[PDB]
């Protein structure tokens, strides 16, 4: 596994977490669960140069 990052750019929740996964697709599912559990409802983008997913509200 390797480590992926999540940046949350919500209307009121901002910050970060990590997850370890065999690929970005599997990391994304963990991050969607975490964001859903925070009530975030946003647009998802991925930066393969830094292994960062971003979820953005606005």
């Amino acid at each position: 596994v390797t480590t992926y990052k999540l940046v949350i750019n919500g209307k009121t929740l901002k910050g970060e977490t990590t997850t370890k996964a065999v690929d970005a697709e599997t990391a994304e599912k963990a991050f969607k669960q975490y964001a859903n559990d925070n009530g975030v409802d946003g647009v998802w983008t991925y930066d393969d140069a830094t292994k960062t997913f971003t979820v953005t509200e606005h």
Partner: protein, 219 residues
């Protein structure tokens, strides 16, 4: 006269645990040894005794069939093994020497922690401003830091710029095995339309570091 107990144990539900109690400074076989446990915030619960001379035992009916007390007289040591562990077996387990049935010398206790939880970062929700003291002109607002494991989490407000009137409460351990806590700040009610309030939550075991703006709103 001393009772020396073994180190803290970390177990999952369904497992077994064996803890030990080594006696010194008196004749081990001359006195029964009791085991008494105490769950966090709760009272003392007797589990049973052993006669270290004969090996005979007497268990509380609640534990019969799941607890075994034994001893090795050559090393003046008593043992308590508890099987089919459940989360509510989480407790300090004391051995205590019988004087007569009553317990005159107690060990320091061995913690057994039984949990199915794995590392999990918190969800962070606003505790929307509520009237605290009407006469005082203050409001309470906060953040709910929910469903994380393990302890602890660190909370600040406004990145350390807001320190007066902060109260971060000890966490609750939920039946799910996850923790939740709340942090509240008491502020002037007049400030709710003009000052921004952000709680900064850091849960390093999950690499989770989030900031939640607490707006004066319901929807």
């Amino acid at each position: 006269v001393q009772l020396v107990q073994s180190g803290a144990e970390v177990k999952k539900p369904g497992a077994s645990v064996k803890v030990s109690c080594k006696a010194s400074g008196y004749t081990f076989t001359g006195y029964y040894m009791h085991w008494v446990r105490q769950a966090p915030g709760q009272g003392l619960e007797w589990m049973g005794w052993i006669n270290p001379n004969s090996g005979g035992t007497n268990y509380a009916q609640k534990f019969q069939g799941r607890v075994t007390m034994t001893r090795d007289t050559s090393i003046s040591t008593a043992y308590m093994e508890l099987s089919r562990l459940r989360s509510d077996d989480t407790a300090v387990y004391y051995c205590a020497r019988d004087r007569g049935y009553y317990m005159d010398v107690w060990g320091k206790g061995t913690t057994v922690t039984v949990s199915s939880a794995s590392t999990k970062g918190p969800s962070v929700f606003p505790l929307a401003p509520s009237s605290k003291s009407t006469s005082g002109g203050t409001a309470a607002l906060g953040c709910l830091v929910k469903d994380y494991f393990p302890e602890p989490v660190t909370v600040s407000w406004n990145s350390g710029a807001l320190t007066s009137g902060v109260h971060t409460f000890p966490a609750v351990l939920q039946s799910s095995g996850l923790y939740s806590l709340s942090s509240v700040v008491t502020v002037p009610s007049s400030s709710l339309g003009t000052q921004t309030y952000i709680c900064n939550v850091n849960h390093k075991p999950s690499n989770t570091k989030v900031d939640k703006k607490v707006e004066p709103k319901s929807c």
